[PDB]
Structures are given as structure tokens and as C-alpha cells.
Predict the structure of putative exotoxin (superantigen).
Amino acid sequence: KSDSENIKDVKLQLNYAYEIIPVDYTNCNIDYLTTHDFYIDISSYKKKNFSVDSEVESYITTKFTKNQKVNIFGLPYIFTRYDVYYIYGGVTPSVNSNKIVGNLLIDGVQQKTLINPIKIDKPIFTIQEFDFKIRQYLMQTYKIYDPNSPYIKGQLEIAINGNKHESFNLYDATSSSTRSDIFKKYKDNKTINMKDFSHFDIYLWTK
Amino acid sequence: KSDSENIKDVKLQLNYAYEIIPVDYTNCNIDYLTTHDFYIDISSYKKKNFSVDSEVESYITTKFTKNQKVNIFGLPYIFTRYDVYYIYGGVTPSVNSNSENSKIVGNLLIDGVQQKTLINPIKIDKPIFTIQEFDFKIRQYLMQTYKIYDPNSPYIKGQLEIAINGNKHESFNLYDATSSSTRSDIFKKYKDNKTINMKDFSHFDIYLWTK
Ligand SMILES: [Zn+2]
Ligand SMILES: [Zn+2]
């Protein structure tokens, strides 16, 4: 009296994970840097003692410096009793500065052509912010993670001017994956320059 | 095969429902009022046209007026492509510098026996606040500390009571969901916009049961 139990469990974990408000703040001071952590102050926003602890993979914090100003866009993977938000990556430098189009295919047939599904005002953003916004767009529009939707496979391709495509699995989780397991991939703090962005291709399958 | 498998699924829905970042903004202007919604501007915070749509029960908006300043603390129940946050209730009059440092004290009882007296397990700045804000914060506290929504915790029944001067004991079920409940179903109770004056607040009790 049950079918496609796993894929349904996988989608459940994903649905739980991405239905969240992101930690989004601009022009924040890096109070301290360790080998794998950014300690960022957002007290001015919170009007209270408040910080963001972003954990990343080796040698990422080495590209930044204490007291540098950065923008944050990360998904919290855990909640505590402290005034601290815990995320992976999502840190980009605040530039002097401070048009996303693509297509969507379902089982080989292009449904959307040159759509502008999301918006990013940063000239430099993390794939984490992009990935998040596309998934929310897909969850909102096609309920890709709802157990009763026919979508069971998917890819998000990102084309960058003067470089090969980059593909990301949209159903990247197991039945026992927590938010932390699913967001761990963002520890690479992968970043993109808006000017270098060409377009994206969303591929969804029901089979 | 099982007999307690339901309370496990119910706890899972609640755990997921309440592991969320709230919509928290102070001193915002009520741009428009309808019979059942508040349209509050938070554009100055977002640095772009952005608003909060708070849906409430009848006879609630008649308590406020357009252009009145309010504070917002609500749990989003749905997301859309629009720059609007959708919440139930969570609206209180914005009075002073909404920066009060009052002490919140409560009694934690398990199976009818007091286990501890909680001192400021949660903090609330505003002098006037919604039970929604209190409920959310206390549930998070209970989740992090006693794992009340973990399938392997013995707690399967619970009540949160808020004591206010005048013998008013507000009481809410802490396990209010089915295995199918969505955030919208769970948060809908907040449409009553129940509010409390910090100066009327006595204390709170947490009754957890294992049977
Ligand atoms: Zn392409
Ligand atoms: Zn009492």
C-alpha cells in the first residue's frame, strides 16, 4: 500500500530544507576569520548584539580580510538559543557598485523560453543565492518537491561567459538528509560576477 | 505494526513548521486596512518596494487605523514571487522605543511535577507583544532544550499557559497538528492576533506529558 517511497522521502527532505527565509544582509563587517569560519557582525541591522557564523571549506576565508565589508546570503541550517545565525558560505565582497534569463524544459520539451524568474541586485553573488531563488521559483510554480507532483529528477545549468556550463542536481538529497547535509555543498562559497553570467537552463523530468 | 507512529508524524510536522526565520520589523506604517488584512510597509528596511500582508480574523483591523505605526512579528506561511511577506496576525501597536528589557519567568512542569523555574529563556523587547511571538520563541527554546518535537523524546502532550493579571491564564496546545498539517494550517490560529501587555504579564507555565 505504498509506491515510490524513497523519491517521495527525498523530495520531502528537500521541501523542508528550502522553504525558509534566508539570512540576507549587505555591507557587514567581518569581525574575525579562522581557518574555516567567517564571523560577521550584523548588530546594526538587528539593533542588538548579533552575528553570522558562516562555515566554509579550506582556504576560502584566505581571500578575505578582517574588517572588510561583505554581503551575506545564506540559508540557516540550524537554530539555537544564541543571537547567531549559522550558514555555509554565502559571503561576497561589497563592491563599489552594488538581467538573469534562462529556459526551462520538462521531459525534453521547452516550456519556458528566456524567462526572468528571479532577481539579484548584486554585481557579485553566490551560486547559493541563485540556486535558492531558482528552487523557490520551482517550488512555487511547479511544486517540484511536493510528494504528489510528477517531478522526480532535475538539473540547474549555469552558463558563464568564457567557461563551460556548470550543472547542479536539483534533487540532491537522501531520505535521511538534514538541512545541514543538503546545504553543506555551499561551503565552497562558489561565486559569480553578474557581468559574466550568460543564462541558465532548468531541466525537469517525470521519468 | 506501531501504536505511537501518529504522535511521531505529528511531532515531525511541528518540528518542521517551527524551524523557521520569523518576519520581524518594528515601527512600520499601516498603508491600508481591509476587513481581514493589514498591508504594512517595510520598504525602508528592504530598500525597495516591499510589504507585509497580515491576514487576521474579523473585528481585528477595526482596532487599528491607516498610517498608524505597528511592529511585526509573524511566521510566514507561504512564499510567492512577489515582494510581500504573508503572515497571520503578528501586529501590535508601536508605542515607545520598543526596547523594553523586562524579565520573563516561567515554570516548567513534566508529568505534573515542577522541574525548574526558567529565567528569561526567551527575550521580548516590545512592551506590547503577540502570543504568536511568545509561542514561537518558547517552542524554539523547548525544541533546542527539551527536544519536545523529536520523535525519540517521551513528550507526546503539552500545554503552554500565559498568566496575566486578572486571573487570565491563556492556554495553548503545544502538539497542535496532524501528520498532514502544513505551516498555513498550523499558523492559522495566529489570525486572532492575541496580544499581551508586558506590564500585565505575570509568568508562564510549560506542561509536558509523557502519558
Ligand atoms: Zn545553456
Ligand atoms: Zn501559572
The first helix of chain A runs from residue 5 to 18. The pocket of zinc ion (ligand 2) is lined by residues B 161, 163, 203, 205 (CB under 6 Å).
